[PDB]
Design a protein around this ligand. Structure first.
Ligand SMILES: COCCCCc1c(C(=O)N(CC(C)C)[C@@H]2CNC[C@H](C(=O)N3CCOCC3)C2)nnn1-c1ccccc1
Ligand SMILES: *[C@@H]1O[C@H](CO)[C@@H](O)[C@H](O)[C@H]1NC(C)=O
Length: 334
């Protein structure tokens, strides 16, 4: 086809980026993260026990209010690196960016307070490949492609730095030159089935003392931060002089601006973040601590161990995900 369409995103505190979808007839609206690091769609279910407080605080899909619902009921569990949801498969009509599609999705009945009581979003729309989909369910973008309406077999992500402006934008079927500049630099995927590319080094200043012999980088739109393995991140943080807490790393806020550049060697170029790009600079006080937008995520094989380039990275680099050619294009965001 020749359709290009967009999903307007909200940016909550530079840590959560989410848009809205409609499910059912009439449409029930959900806030969802669009996640290239997974391939299932899910929303919380009306059948979620209200003893799960997350299900008290989020919008619940009620199949009993939708005339286009089609029962399946196969149990499924989605195990993310940060937590787990469980429930069952349903089918209904999903509206995303004014595109309407028949989609199998998870109705989540078990929704733990961590992390989901911290989520502004209700659910997740996986933008990964069918090969990562739990229960082999056709991901939403594969179903949109099957309709033959999109101009290209690509989707693009813009995540704004500002958190009276759009928080971000997903273009389905292309990219938006309003939100990037210069040429795209394209890196091929290591393989179809995952949005993962070869990385050739991680530098702190001019010193590439990480990933010297090559490593993996997942381009993960559903992650808040840049992440690496615990041992990788520990060495990175020792070089920055950052202190490890339970869930994050911190520096004294006065040190934040003095922190060195971090470069990611992707497809022959250095993608450099300055301290402004990865320090939550909420203060300049030596008596306060400022969080870094980088932390440990230990991802098991076959996907990991791997780095993941989340919102911290995507904020600087507008990202095109090319399904037609199995590649990722990065351009300077604006
Ligand atoms: C850009 O906006 C994203 C905001 C969500 C970030 C997040 C994640 C998160 O990073 N993920 C799973 C999520 C999508 C349910 C990621 C999404 N991508 C897949 C990741 C994953 O599970 N893996 C394991 C398999 O290999 C790929 C990485 C997890 N977990 N909790 N939170 C969060 C929850 C409340 C408050 C603040 C953060
Ligand atoms: C659920 O979907 C699977 C695979 O698409 C199918 O084999 C099964 O019959 C469905 N179950 C029900 C109860 O409709």
């Amino acid at each position: 086809g020749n359709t290009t369409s967009s999903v307007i995103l909200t940016n909550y505190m530079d840590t959560q980026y989410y848009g809205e979808i409609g499910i059912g007839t009439p449409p029930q609206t959900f806030k969802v993260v669009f996640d290239t690091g997974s391939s299932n769609v899910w929303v919380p279910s009306s059948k979620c026990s209200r003893l799960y407080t997350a299900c008290v605080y989020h919008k619940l899909f009620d199949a009993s209010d939708s005339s286009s619902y089609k029962h399946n009921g196969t149990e499924l569990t989605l195990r993310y690196s940060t937590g787990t949801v469980s429930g069952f498969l349903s089918q209904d009509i999903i509206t995303v960016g004014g595109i309407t599609v028949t989609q199998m999705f998870g109705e989540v009945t078990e929704m733990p307070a961590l992390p989901f009581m911290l989520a502004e979003f209700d659910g997740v729309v996986g933008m990964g490949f069918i090969e990562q989909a739990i229960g082999r369910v056709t991901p939403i973008f594969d179903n949109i492609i099957s309709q033959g309406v999109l101009k290209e077999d690509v989707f693009s992500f813009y995540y704004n730095r500002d958190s009276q402006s759009l928080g971000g934008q997903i273009v389905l079927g292309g990219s938006d030159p309003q939100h990037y500049e210069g040429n795209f630099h394209y890196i091929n995927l290591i393989k179809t089935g995952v949005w993962q590319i070869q990385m050739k080094g991680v530098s702190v200043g001019s010193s590439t003392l990480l990933c010297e012999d090559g490593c993996l980088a997942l381009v993960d739109t559903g992650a808040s931060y840049i992440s690496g393995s615990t041992s990788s991140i520990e060495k990175l943080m020792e070089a920055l002089g950052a202190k490890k807490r339970l869930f994050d790393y911190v520096v004294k806020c006065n040190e934040g601006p003095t922190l060195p550049d971090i470069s990611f060697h992707l497809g022959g170029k250095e993608y450099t973040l300055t301290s402004a790009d990865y320090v939550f600079q909420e203060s300049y006080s030596s008596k306060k601590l400022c969080t870094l937008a980088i932390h440990a995520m230990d991802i098991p094989p076959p996907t990991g161990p791997t780095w993941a380039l989340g919102a911290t990275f995507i904020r600087k680099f507008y990202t095109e995900f090319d399904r037609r050619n199995n590649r990722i294009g990065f351009a300077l965001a604006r």
